[PDB]
Every structure is written in C-alpha cells, then in structure tokens.
Design a protein around this motif. Structure first.
Motif, PDB file in Angstrom:
ATOM      1  N   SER C  42       0.789  -1.240   0.000  1.00  0.00           N
ATOM      2  CA  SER C  42       0.000   0.000   0.000  1.00  0.00           C
ATOM      3  C   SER C  42       0.838   1.317   0.000  1.00  0.00           C
ATOM      4  CB  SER C  42      -0.971  -0.034   1.199  1.00  0.00           C
ATOM      5  OG  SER C  42      -1.999  -1.036   1.099  1.00  0.00           O
ATOM      6  N   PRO C  43       1.758   1.475  -0.956  1.00  0.00           N
ATOM      7  CA  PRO C  43       2.462   2.748  -1.071  1.00  0.00           C
ATOM      8  C   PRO C  43       1.457   3.829  -1.472  1.00  0.00           C
ATOM      9  CG  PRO C  43       2.735   1.437  -3.051  1.00  0.00           C
ATOM     10  CD  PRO C  43       2.034   0.579  -2.092  1.00  0.00           C
ATOM     11  N   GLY C  44       1.639   5.061  -0.977  1.00  0.00           N
ATOM     12  CA  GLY C  44       0.806   6.215  -1.350  1.00  0.00           C
ATOM     13  C   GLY C  44      -0.251   6.681  -0.345  1.00  0.00           C
ATOM     14  N   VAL C  45      -0.528   5.875   0.671  1.00  0.00           N
ATOM     15  CA  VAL C  45      -1.566   6.237   1.638  1.00  0.00           C
ATOM     16  C   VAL C  45      -1.285   7.593   2.294  1.00  0.00           C
ATOM     17  CG1 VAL C  45      -2.997   5.558   3.632  1.00  0.00           C
ATOM     18  CG2 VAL C  45      -2.017   3.750   2.124  1.00  0.00           C
ATOM     19  N   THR C  46      -0.035   7.832   2.684  1.00  0.00           N
ATOM     20  CA  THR C  46       0.330   9.101   3.275  1.00  0.00           C
ATOM     21  C   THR C  46       0.042  10.265   2.326  1.00  0.00           C
ATOM     22  OG1 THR C  46       2.070   8.187   4.732  1.00  0.00           O
ATOM     23  CG2 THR C  46       2.217  10.525   4.145  1.00  0.00           C
ATOM     24  N   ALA C  47       0.369  10.099   1.048  1.00  0.00           N
ATOM     25  CA  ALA C  47       0.103  11.131   0.060  1.00  0.00           C
ATOM     26  C   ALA C  47      -1.401  11.421  -0.055  1.00  0.00           C
ATOM     27  CB  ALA C  47       0.683  10.708  -1.329  1.00  0.00           C
ATOM     28  N   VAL C  48      -2.211  10.368   0.012  1.00  0.00           N
ATOM     29  CA  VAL C  48      -3.661  10.520  -0.009  1.00  0.00           C
ATOM     30  C   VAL C  48      -4.117  11.326   1.207  1.00  0.00           C
ATOM     31  CG1 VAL C  48      -5.913   9.342   0.162  1.00  0.00           C
ATOM     32  CG2 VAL C  48      -4.016   8.274  -1.196  1.00  0.00           C
ATOM     33  N   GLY C  86      -6.582   5.847   2.877  1.00  0.00           N
ATOM     34  CA  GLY C  86      -6.394   7.205   3.393  1.00  0.00           C
ATOM     35  C   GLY C  86      -7.671   7.762   4.014  1.00  0.00           C
ATOM     36  N   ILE C  87      -8.799   7.524   3.362  1.00  0.00           N
ATOM     37  CA  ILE C  87     -10.071   7.985   3.880  1.00  0.00           C
ATOM     38  C   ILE C  87     -10.382   7.304   5.210  1.00  0.00           C
ATOM     39  CG2 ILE C  87     -12.544   8.055   3.481  1.00  0.00           C
ATOM     40  CD1 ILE C  87     -11.720   8.212   0.356  1.00  0.00           C
ATOM     41  N   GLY C  88     -10.090   6.019   5.292  1.00  0.00           N
ATOM     42  CA  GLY C  88     -10.364   5.221   6.503  1.00  0.00           C
ATOM     43  C   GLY C  88      -9.493   5.632   7.681  1.00  0.00           C
ATOM     44  N   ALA C  89      -8.230   5.936   7.410  1.00  0.00           N
ATOM     45  CA  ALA C  89      -7.303   6.458   8.437  1.00  0.00           C
ATOM     46  C   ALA C  89      -7.786   7.792   9.019  1.00  0.00           C
ATOM     47  CB  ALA C  89      -5.891   6.631   7.810  1.00  0.00           C
ATOM     48  N   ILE C  90      -8.213   8.679   8.126  1.00  0.00           N
ATOM     49  CA  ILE C  90      -8.755   9.931   8.570  1.00  0.00           C
ATOM     50  C   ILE C  90     -10.034   9.702   9.375  1.00  0.00           C
ATOM     51  CG2 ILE C  90      -9.722  12.187   7.916  1.00  0.00           C
ATOM     52  CD1 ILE C  90      -7.693  12.153   5.551  1.00  0.00           C
TER      53      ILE C  90
END
Ligand SMILES: O=C(O)CCC(=O)C(=O)O
Ligand SMILES: O=C(O)CCC(=O)C(=O)O
Ligand SMILES: O=C(O)CCC(=O)C(=O)O
Ligand SMILES: O=C(O)CCC(=O)C(=O)O
Ligand SMILES: [Cl-]
Ligand SMILES: [Cl-]
Ligand SMILES: [Cl-]
Ligand SMILES: [Cl-]
Ligand SMILES: [Mg+2]
Ligand SMILES: [Mg+2]
Ligand SMILES: [Mg+2]
Ligand SMILES: [Mg+2]
Ligand code: NA
Ligand code: NA
Ligand code: NA
Ligand code: NA
Lengths: 396, 396, 396, 396
Positions: C42-48, C86-90
């Motif tokens: 899952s690369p990119g989650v931080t960018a999201v 990313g949405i789920g982390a937020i």
C-alpha cells in the motif's frame, strides 16, 4: 342465526408459561375453541385477537375465509408474526364452531380424513425433564438420566424422540439456547465445548433408545450457517431422523443442507405460502414444519398443498397443551404428505383437568378422534382454578 | 448512574387515530421519548413494549444495540411486524435518552449531520382533507377542491405533493382503499371506473400545482401487479415524481417497475436489511421508503447503508405527529443517499399543544434542529387533556 | 469551536516495516489519533491523507460522515485501495477526536458495547518467530520450534492460534509466499513439496497445542482455486477453526468453499458493502474478515450489519501496533455478529514505549477498555526516538 | 546491456491541473516515456511509481510483463485504483523504451497496426470553454456560445462532439458535477432544473452541429440509476451517439441501459478484465471505455480482446496531454473492435512547447504516426519552464 355473538380470550397457568384460548360463541349457542401461545417470542397476540374479534361479532360463523381476507386487509402493513398469530387463533376457533355447527370432526372440513392414526415423535425428550424439572419428572440431571429417558421412550413403544442442545461438563446440566439469549452470546458461535457435549448427549440417548428408535435433533436458532455446518460434520456418523434448524436465510440454510448427511427440517416459525416459498426455491429443506396453531389450520392446508407440489412432506409444530394437539391431529388426519407428528409426552400434573378429552396413543401413534370439532374442549372452571402468571416462555 | 429506571407508554387522541409514546427515564433524571403507532394495521405494539421494557430496566441507557440484540433473541420466532415495531419504539426512546445524556442532537449519534435542511413533500395532499375533513380543512369534496389544494401547496413554496386514489363520479368524493378493506373487494381488481377517476384527479391536481411542482402518487396495497400495470399504462403520459406501490412480491413489483415509465418507490412496511434484500435483488425499486419509526433509527441507518451500496436513495416514512417528524429529520440529516422527506403539512388543531417544539419549514424544506435529543418532547399535561379513543386508523 | 485545525501524519520504525499515524487536532485542543499502514501492498496512503486532510481543516470534527461523503466524491474515479485506506485512516482519527470531545470510549459512538471482553487468536504464530526472528523471539527454525511455540500458546491460556505456509525440508525454514512474490512464481502452483510441508508443520503445531486449542490456517493469496482445493483435500483430516483464503474471484472462492470440509474465511482486503457483496452472493465464505483500519470503523459497522443480514459473523483484521488493536477492540465491542478477534501476541521490544496504554489480556480474551477515544495514544517523543526506515512489508 | 538504469517522475503545469510523466532510462541510453495523472481523483500515484521503480532498476527493459506480474504480487492487497495507475504508468514507459530499442512504433509491439487513421470525437466540447475559460477560449458563457462551439466543430470537419451537464438559467453558466462534490449534494438527485437545462443545452448544441455531426453526452458519476433513467426519458427524442454513465453497480447500470433508447457507454475508471467482467455479464454497456493511461496499454489489449469476445467495441479514455493522445493512438491503431477515439481539441497555449511532436488531424481523423515509440516525447527544458501547482483536477 349463524352469527358470531362473542369472541373471548382466556388464559391459565402451564407452569413455566401460560396457555391461552379463544372462545367464540354463535347465536345458536355453539362454542368454538382454539389454543394459542404468547411465550414463544410472541407478546401481543391477545391484544390482536381482542381488536380483530370486535370486527367478527355480527358476521357469519360459516364464512371463515371471508374473515381471514378482511383481517389480512385490515392488518396488511404489519402482517406476519404476532398479527398473523391472532388471525390464526381466531381461524381455528371459527373452524371448531363451524364443524360443531355441522356436527362433524374438523377433519371433515379439511377434505375428510385419509388416515385413522398418525405416528408421532416424543418431543423435548429429555429437554422438558432437564429444563423444567419442577413440572416434568423424573428430573434429568446427568448423562445416565439422558439414557434412561430414552429407555423409557422405547419401552413405551414410541418410535422416535427429539432432543435439543445441552452442556453436561460445566457444572449442573443445562440447555444451550443462545438463539434465545440463554446465555446472551449474540454471535451464536459454536465452540469445542458445544460440540463434544452434543456428541456425549446423543451417544447416551442412542444408548438408551436402542438401534430401532429414531432420534431427531433440534438446533432451533442457536447458530449461524458456519456453526450448523460444524455441528453436522461433528455428527456425520450419527443416525439422525432429522436435524431441525430455524433460519431467516434461505440461502444459508440451503448451503447447510447441501452439505448435510442428515435430513434437514425447518420453517416452524414461518407464515403463509409466501414465507415458505424462498426456502423451497432454494432447496433448503427435506421436511417443512408447519405451525398450524400460528397460521390457522385452513391457511396451513394451503401451505401443505404447496409443499406437496414440491414433493416435500410436512410436520405440524405441536408443543403446547391438549387442544393444540387435537387441532394438529385434525390437520395430520387430512394431509397426504405428512412426515410425522410432534407431541410432548411429558405432561403437566393438571393438564388433563383443563380439557374434556385427552389425546389417546397406541403403539406409538396418535388416534384421530371422531367427535364434533377439534376433539376436546378447555374446561372454564378448571382454567379459573389455574390462574396465569406473568408471561413466561422465552420471556421468562 | 446511567441505568434505565422506567419505561412507560402514553397515548392521546389524534382524531381518527391515536398517537402513542414511549417515555424512558434514567437514574440521572434524563427522559428519552419516542412516538409510535398502532392504527396502521398494528394492534399489540403497546403490549410488546410493556413486556420488553421490563427487561430493560436496570440496564445501561448507553447500550442500545445490546438491548436490540437481546430483544431480537427473546422474540426471534415472531420477529417482524408488531414485535419489531415495539423494539423500534424502544430503540428510538433510548437514542433520545443517550443523545440528551451526552448533550447532543440525535444526528450526532448517527454520523453527524451532512445537511442543515431537507426538501420535503406535502403528503396526503389532498388525501387528509377528503378522508378526514372533520380534522383537516378546508374540506375537499370535488375536483375544484382538488385543484385548489394543489394551488395552495404551490403558493406555500412546497416543491412536491403526494395524493392517493379517489372516486369522483359515484356520489360523494371518497377514497379507493380495497387493500385495506375500504371497500371490501379482496381481489383488488382495477376497473375502468378506477382508471378514469385517477386520471381526472391528477389532471385537476396538475392544474392547480402548475408545471414545476412535483406530483407523487401512492397506490399503497390497492392492486395486484396486473392492476398496477394497467394504472401505469393509463398514466403513461403524466409527469410523476414517483409511483408508490407496496407489495410482498419482489418478483411482481420488479415486473411492474420494468414496465413503468415512472420511478417506483416501495418498502415502507418492511423490517431490516433482510426484508429489503429480495426487493433490491429483483431490481424492484427506484426509491426505498424506510420506516424508521417502525424499525428504529439505528436499524434504519443499516438499511440506508445497504441501499446506498445498491445506489438506491431512501425516503423516510413520516405520516404521524411532530415527534415522528423530528425523529425522521435526524435520520434525514445523517443519510447521504436521501431522496426527499415525507411530511403531512395538514395538522390537527391541537398538534402544537402536544409538543414542546414544532417542525420549522422554509422555502419548501425542513430545518434540522440542533437541540439535545430528537428536537421536541411530548407534553404530559397536554397528552392527558386529549384522552385517546378506541383504536382507529385501518381498524376504524 | 469544534473545527479541525490540523491533520498530520507521523511514522516510526516497526522493525521490518513502519507504523504510520494520523494526528488530528481540534480548535478545542483535543487530539484524535489513528494508526495506518503502507507496507501491506500500500504505497501512497500518506500522500492521499496529506491531500484529503487539507480539505478537512476548517470543517466540524463532529461531522465524520460528511467528510467521508465528500472524500468519496472527490476521489470517486480511483476509489478503493490506497485511496480508501487514506479515507479510513482519517475517519478513525475523527472518531477518536469526537469520542474524546464527548468524553466517551469510541464504542459509545458505535451503538454502545455489547460485550466487556473479546476472545482472540494469537496470529502469526509461529509465523513472526520464523520470518522476523531479529524482532520476535525465541527464533523458530525447525519443527520442534513450531511445536514449542504452540505449547507456549496453550500454557498462556490462548484459545486459538493462526499459522501460514512454511517449507521445512529444503534447507533453512522459510515462508512460502508466492502470492507476494516470495518466491517469484506467479502461477502460484501448489506442488507435492508444498503439501507435505504444510502437513508436517500442522502436525507439529497440533502436537504442541493439544486437542483443545484451535488452529487457524492462512493461505493468503498463495494459490489459485485449483491449488487451494488440493491443499484442503490434503488437510481433510485436520481439525481447523478456519482456512483463510484471499481471492478476487468470488466464483472461484465459492467453488473452493463448496468442496471444503473446513470453515472458510476471506475478505480482509476488501472495501465497503460493494466489494463484499459478490462474495456473499456467491456463498463464498463462512467468516468475513473486515479490515477496519483500512475501511474506517464507521464504514466497517455498515459492512458488519450487511454480513449480519446474511448470518455471517465477522472478524477484524488486526496485525499492526497497539493503536490498531484498540481501534479493533472498540469495533469488536459493538458488533453482535463477532466471530473472534485477531491479535499478534509477539511484540516489538519497543512496542509499549510507543503508546500510552497496552492492550490487556486475561484468560485468552482482550479486555475492552473504557477510556475516552480508542483507549491508547501514540507518544510523539517515543515515535521520534524510533525513526522510520524506507518502506518495508511486502515492499521489502 | 538492456537493463533499466533509472525510473524518474516529472510534473508540469497544465493550468487547472498538472501533467505527470515517467522517464525510464536504459543502459543503452534509450529513454522511454509515459504520461499519467493525479488530478482525476488520484492522489498518490507518484508515490506508488517511486516505490515500484526502485524494484525495476537492474531488470531487463524487454520484460514488461515480468515487471507487471511482480508488481501485482507486491501490491496485491491494495490493487486497483492509484496502485494500478502507478503500475500502468510504468508499463507504458517500458513499452516506449522497448519499441525504441527495437526501432519501431509502439503499435508494432501490439499486433501491428490495422488502420492508418482513427476517427475521433472532440471531447469536452464546450465543457472546457465553460469550466476552464482562463485556459481555453473563446470562453462560453451562454446558450449562443454553446451553439457557436458546435458550429466550429462542424466547420473543422469533426464528426462528433461530447458535452457534459450545465446549468444555464441560475445565474452564470456552470457545470453540474455533484458526483465530484461540485456542488456537494451527495444523494445525486436529478431535479426538474437539471432536466430542462440539459434539454436547452443539447438543443443549442444540435442547432450549431447540424444534422450530420454526432453528439455524445457524458453524465459521469452525477446521478443514481433513478436519475439516469429520468435523464434518458427526458432525452428520448434526441439523436445521441452515446450516453456515458459511470457506475460501480453493474446491476443498476444494466437496468438503465435496458430502458435506454440510446447507446450506453461506461467503464473508464475500471481496471483489468476482472473489473470489466461483471458489467459485460450484466449486459450493462453498448461501448466499453478503456483507460489505457491508467491500465497500461498491454493490460488494455487484454481488456479489448475480452470485449471483442462479447462483440463489444472499445473507446480509449483520452483527456490529458499530447503524449496521452499518442499512447492511445497506438492502442487505437492495433485494436480491431475500436468504436472511436476521444480527444480534447481545445489545447493549452503551451501544450505544443511541452512535446516534440503534436498529434495531426485530417478530415476528422487522427493520423497514426510511424516514429519509434509512442510518437512524441516530453521536452525536459519546457517542463521545467512550466512548474507545477498544488494538485488540481477534482481536488481543486
Ligand atoms: O424447543 C423450543 O424452544 C420449542 C419449539 C420447537 O423448536 C419445537 O417444538 O420443535
Ligand atoms: O396512505 C396511507 O394509508 C398511509 C401510509 C402511506 O402509505 C404513506 O404515508 O406513504
Ligand atoms: O500474513 C500476512 O501477510 C499478513 C495479513 C494477514 O493475512 C492476516 O493478518 O490475517
Ligand atoms: O469529464 C470529466 O470529468 C473527465 C473524464 C471523462 O469523463 C471523459 O473524458 O470522458
Ligand atoms: Cl457473542
Ligand atoms: Cl373482489
Ligand atoms: Cl510460476
Ligand atoms: Cl443531497
Ligand atoms: Mg423446533
Ligand atoms: Mg405509502
Ligand atoms: Mg489473512
Ligand atoms: Mg467520461
Ligand atoms: Na417468523
Ligand atoms: Na410488513
Ligand atoms: Na483489495
Ligand atoms: Na475505479
């Protein structure tokens, strides 16, 4: 005239639950009775009956399907469940009144009889002696007790017995009924403890029954498909007449059945051809259990005919008092595609006081009576000698 | 403590039916309310609540899903219908108590709000003025009355109105409600008379509404698929926002929709994801109507999420008193996939006396309030000033 | 005010992978946290998160479903996968902030709790001790080591353990993970070597576990249906709690399950009711694994409710750090249809330094905490004492 | 050697969004390029590329399917979306490098060409001139502007044009894009205002186009099935080449298409045969739009072949810069079942500066070039003269 003059309800103690009755009187003086129940998840049935009965007074006792059709219209938005239970109780009282009016047994309104006697199984055996030992003895409190109850069934010429799920090795012997919140474990997971106890119980029961007597297992609503599958795998090598599983998932039940080496029964809580249909469409059952006390016997004839077209045999749901048994007897008498009839052989010490006639058994079969109406009447004076308690059953 | 100390029911006159309420008190002194109904085919709900509430006293007010799960277990055999209505009424009272306990509007328990205002349609327009003219005026007794009611909606900035089926040319103006046995014609056939009257009515309503205001048509349970199809063909050239059809036949409803040039709504009488599923599987609806008063708002969030996954928008069923409206407002505030909200703009002369706050409308939209709980409380003293009558509604 | 003032991400060393966190601050000074992951494909989650968080600043912390709905619109074309992560982390950080704002544990936003403790299984046992011996000891390098790890689980009162696929007889002990290109054999064929090693491993594990402890097997994405079927046939005579299989072929998975004598679990990589639906439609699973870290706990409640309507029990996917465990604990507390909870009992030597509270276990169950928010906070100063490495996990 | 030595990303201003590129260098000195995008709901693609590119350095430039297979394994849990976009961008750079290495146009790696020229439609016409008037002129601000843009297309020999949804009668002319939260109305309801504006717009566009030029309508994700159906009914009498509808509901889309008098296109956001399959199984589309920029051209050949077996023609999704156009040109050249090609004829004032060659059009068709690789190279020096802004597109 043939008009209904009054519709009343009555209630009496049945130990850990109450019995309820509809009493319907015609202008001729004929009294039709039914028995119904609220303890099996069903508060409000009496309230339904009291409203719907008001509409019935003044109408013809002969026109029971007119009443049903009207009732169904008036309660269409909330049909099913306790509403449909009230309609079915009234239907069954109306059928009794009409049969008595024409001086025939109820089975003569249902196509005539096609058998004189019906094989039964002794249900809740040893379930009643374990769960309600204050009312049914001798109390069963261990595996040897389980075996002896099975031995007693055989000696008494019963051909089949039905048990439930019990825990033997965690203190006192107790029922496993998480589907009904005893205990409250709403996931309904089936662990190793549940599995080895089921095994121990059935081995003891088979021990007592001998090789000829049939053993039925009822799992009620006590698992999810996952757990039912685990139970069936665990019991792959047992000779079971059926395994009974209640489910509101036709897809799920069908899956379980497809992987079952035992016949599967279900449907005891369902109402009308409509609710049965998705189960039959899915190939979900070997046997359809029909609750004619809930549905009404006339509506249940429609359901039996539907099952018959699918080459499915039906079994009445019968675990209440003598009038319920006699209602189901008349259904059983008339239905060609009849699997077997359920009956509770363990009786309350006052059961016989409450009714004018007791069901008669011979060589493991129920004799279908030939008196006008269902074949037994509740006795008002005895009902009043046994005042009810607050709701019991599942709500105890 | 946060324990529930009491669960009570109350009832008052609403003219041609009664309003019912659950009053739940916590050990902190917080009171949670809900509104429920028995007149819409639903005798027995109060009896259900009185049993289930007994089990709730002593439990934590915060744990509403624990209560639901337990209740569902205890009543599993007769779930749905009036049983599920009792559970939903209790759920809604519990939600009010919890929101008040945390000092927030109920929508803050439901994901937070995502809109401040909700567009509504003025429901039972002119249905209430025709069928219950003693309670809602000015009485509507002819086609010109139909037109003027529609003109009034437009002048009042309502964006949409919903009517039912009426007979104009057979003596006095009257509702056609055979699905509910008014009149008793249980086949529910649709003849030429029904068709040309529907046409005459809608033409008059469109006349008064103008070309911008949306017109909804509710056919309830008043036909079989055959007849619904005949109605839709007859009305092929009308601009209808939706046609509402209740059915216990997903297959049948899907067929009708497949041949409909208008959007089809249904499902107002259904309970849980389980009952909605066969309708969605069948492609039976454009819009799912959800009765959150019946289901409970928490259970209804699950249903809305299920609809959302099918790209189906939902509409609350709302045709009772102010507290019902405020309950639905909080649902409407929180649900992304919201079609529109139903509301009855015709009010009882004493409606406002019964409640602490009235719903507020502006430019055809309901303003979502921001007070703790649902946004309004029944007033005990006014309830007692309006004693109930015997059951009305469908049972009148 | 209740506005979000900042959304930040932080990252620290977790040995062979990094931990990531969202830190959300409100104008009140309340800080909500979540944990997320990039190493699991899952690369990119931080960018999201960094893009989506910009839109959130200035919005109300209370309105988490508004944020989700907006986010989903803004990223609709590329929904799923790392966008949805990313949405789920937020979402999970927002839930923490809202619960803390209202001074309650997160389970109070989710329906209240319905259980105090959750049974767990000890996951990656002995997987972590074999694959990452530099971080989790004692190192496991042979079949006797496999047995002793299982013995340790039993002595520690764990009720269940989960292992993966290992090769014992081809030099050093190593994982078989071709689904993740270790080794690169993209056909994912299952040969005789794979089969007899699986057998040897499980026999040793069963040896150490004893007959009561449950054994779970995870096959991840390491075969095609053909190979999964061969594995299950090979292991027909083992007592397995479940066999876990990830698949983007509902048809294929359903086929395997239909021929499986063990319960099948899957779905850990799926997002939303939408992605779960085809699996449930196909009868593909006994148990649905839900990744609430990926989905967000609010979205996961919708998924659990959908599973519940299918009488499918769910299990959280939980194989990260303490905050992930506490997030899942709150989910597990609130969901009725809960199968069991996953947890990694092997811990990093610095795991406890990173967080204010550790998960507490007793008699093989996780105790659900009752502190405001998820129940633990990352510690900024300790995070900075453990700087991250370049991406690891599957990308190592 | 033929090893990859470096994989870099570059970014430049494209006005209201950025262009992104992959630059891949081999040990031979050959440079392969691709273009990709983040603004279309897709933050994180660059981060994906930067991780995955690390694994590629040292590998053979010739083995692009080896890279794909490995990448897919490494990111299997979070496949699709922005992960798959990164893989596709890298694939397209690898294809350019390999074609240049063998001294052929990319279509020679794809089966050879089967056509020299491809008919196109002028996309976002007048969408770009309305929504981004600062970058594309002459600005369109009213219905007469809509007509004149259509007249211009005809005079320029374009055979087809595609428009979107616009509001003309509520102040300034503006796009209706609720699917992308412009405006935030997450129910995506379609009201009367939306319908009559669509009608007014298309009538004006048809006015300008004349009777021969084809008109395409793109509705993107801007409704639910209910609303799409209302739109199609409203536009029943228009001659539309296709109506484009994006949906994550194959069932829903199929329903709409079944009731559509116009050809339906969809699928532009989907990845792999896997995601396309449920749409084809459901009969959901007339035309499949394939995003080869997202998928990679090699993966897109697999998708085109799958569509071909269903007798479905495909159309590339092409709404970025010149390199994207040339990538799609090579796809279009090689695919037998090609519906038409999308292209944006409105260009940035600096578009041509960024690339070594411009796409050439003649008599409404794109000329397929015959230079090594895709047919155009980004110009590093011009890219640096146009520094990027913060993410735009849907995230603006
Ligand atoms: O066992 C029970 O709870 C009673 C009903 C039943 O399942 C039966 O009689 O078959
Ligand atoms: O019209 C009725 O009988 C009341 C319920 C209803 O159908 C509605 O409000 O939509
Ligand atoms: O085993 C892995 O690679 C980690 C994820 C997983 O499958 C699990 O925790 O169940
Ligand atoms: O219209 C848009 O938002 C861009 C993408 C699209 O739908 C197209 O080019 O067909
Ligand atoms: Cl549980
Ligand atoms: Cl009739
Ligand atoms: Cl291979
Ligand atoms: Cl909206
Ligand atoms: Mg039973
Ligand atoms: Mg209605
Ligand atoms: Mg797993
Ligand atoms: Mg498009
Ligand atoms: Na039932
Ligand atoms: Na119903
Ligand atoms: Na996935
Ligand atoms: Na997509």
């Amino acid at each position: 005239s043939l008009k209904v003059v009054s519709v009343d309800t009555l209630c009496c103690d049945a130990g850990w639950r109450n019995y309820h009755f509809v009493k319907l009187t015609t202008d001729e003086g004929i009294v039709g009775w039914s028995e119904f129940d609220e303890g099996f998840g069903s508060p409000g049935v009496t309230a339904v009956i009291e409203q719907l009965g008001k509409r019935l007074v003044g109408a013809s006792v002969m026109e029971h399907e007119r009443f049903f059709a009207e009732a169904y219209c008036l309660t269409r938005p909330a049909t099913g469940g306790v509403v449909s239970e009230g309609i079915g109780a009234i239907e069954n009282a109306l059928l009794d009144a009409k049969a008595k009016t024409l001086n025939v047994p109820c089975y003569e309104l249902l196509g005539g009889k096609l058998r004189d006697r019906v094989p039964v199984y002794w249900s809740h055996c040893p379930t009643w002696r374990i769960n309600h030992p204050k009312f049914f003895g001798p109390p069963v409190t261990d595996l040897d007790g389980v075996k002896r109850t099975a031995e007693e069934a055989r000696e008494r010429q019963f051909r089949a017995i039905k048990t439930n799920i019990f825990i033997h090795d965690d203190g006192p012997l107790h029922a496993w009924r998480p589907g009904f919140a005893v205990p409250f474990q709403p996931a309904l997971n089936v662990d190793r403890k549940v599995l080895r106890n089921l095994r121990a119980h059935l081995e003891a029961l088979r021990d007592g029954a001998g090789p000829d007597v049939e053993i039925l297992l009822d799992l009620n609503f006590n698992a999810k498909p996952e757990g039912y599958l685990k139970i069936l795998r665990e019991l792959a090598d047992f000779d079971l007449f059926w395994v009974e599983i209640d489910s509101y998932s036709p897809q799920g039940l069908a899956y379980v059945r497809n992987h079952s080496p035992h016949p599967i029964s279900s449907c005891e809580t369902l109402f009308g051809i409509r609710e049965f249909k998705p189960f039959f469409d899915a190939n979900a059952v070997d046997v359809a259990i029909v609750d004619t006390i809930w549905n009404g016997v006339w509506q249940s004839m429609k359901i039996a005919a539907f099952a018959d077209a699918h080459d499915i045999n039906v079994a009445p749901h019968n675990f209440y008092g003598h009038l319920c048994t006699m209602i189901n007897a008349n259904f059983a008498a008339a239905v060609p595609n009849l699997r077997i009839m359920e009956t509770d052989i363990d009786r309350l010490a006052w059961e016989d006081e409450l009714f004018t006639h007791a069901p008669e058994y011979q060589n493991g079969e129920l004799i279908i009576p030939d008196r006008p109406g269902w074949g037994t009447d509740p006795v008002e004076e005895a009902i009043l000698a046994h005042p009810p308690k607050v709701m019991g059953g599942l709500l105890q």
